Design a protein around this nucleic acid. Structure first.
Length: 48
RNA sequence: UUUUUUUUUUUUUUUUUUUUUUUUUUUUUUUUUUUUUUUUUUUUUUUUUUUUUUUUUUUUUUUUUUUUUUUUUUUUUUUUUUUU
């Protein structure tokens, strides 16, 4: 979402929720990062 | 919840028998008579050293493979209604 980039954050509640989504989406990749990175994006989408 | 019954009535002394009578000493036999020394045999005569063989002759490095590829949240139900 283009609005998610230039978004002003001042509430701690919004920052925490925003951070986890960035954290969670990164942590999905570790499951299939070295085994079969090319064949990913199927289980990763399922996890998301 | 509960509804019955739940005293007693007979009999219950005794009657026989219960001393004793036989037998119960003894009579045989019961010493002994044989046999019972000895007569053979009983030294020895073979054999008994030795004669083979007995070193050795092969082989004995190595040649493959040896990462991974899926899945992995959840979706129902869950008071009671008698009798006593």
């Amino acid at each position: 979402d283009s609005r998610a980039y230039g978004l002003r954050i001042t509430d701690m509640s919004t920052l925490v929720s925003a951070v986890i989504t960035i954290e969670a989406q990164i942590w999905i990749l570790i499951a299939k990062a070295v085994t079969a990175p090319d064949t990913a994006e199927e289980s990763e989408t399922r996890r998301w």
